[PDB]
Design a protein around this ligand. Sequence first.
Ligand SMILES: COCCNC(=O)N1CCN(C(=O)c2ccc(C)o2)CC1
Length: 119
Amino acid sequence: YDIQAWKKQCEELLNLIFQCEDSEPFRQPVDLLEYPDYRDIIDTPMDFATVRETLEAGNYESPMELCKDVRLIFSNSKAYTPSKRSRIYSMSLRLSAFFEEHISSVLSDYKSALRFHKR
Ligand SMILES: COCCNC(=O)N1CCN(C(=O)c2ccc(C)o2)CC1
């Protein structure tokens, strides 16, 4: 029933993601010299360094907010990909499965802890 526990859980999940080769494309911003049309397709860039920095700045109130930004990384990859069999998109889908597998308990425990606080 620890209402704060999600934050370290998210820090340790981001550490796992940063160790994962599938996160390589999603750590830092997209260079427009390399993808000149990226912002013609993607309105709101997002990457795992920005998620980690937002977390470490104390600028997430809940793991749901972190989960919306992580999911935006994946939806951007799906929107930008020219093919569902692209290398970078294919890395996004595996990383997304890994992230959803690990975040499900973090969200559950947080919401459980809030409910207990409100009881
Ligand atoms: C080493 O990473 C450098 C920073 N990252 C990127 O440059 N990008 C990551 C995001 N992204 C895509 O999701 C995507 C889908 C299909 C294709 C071709 O790219 C565009 C490339």
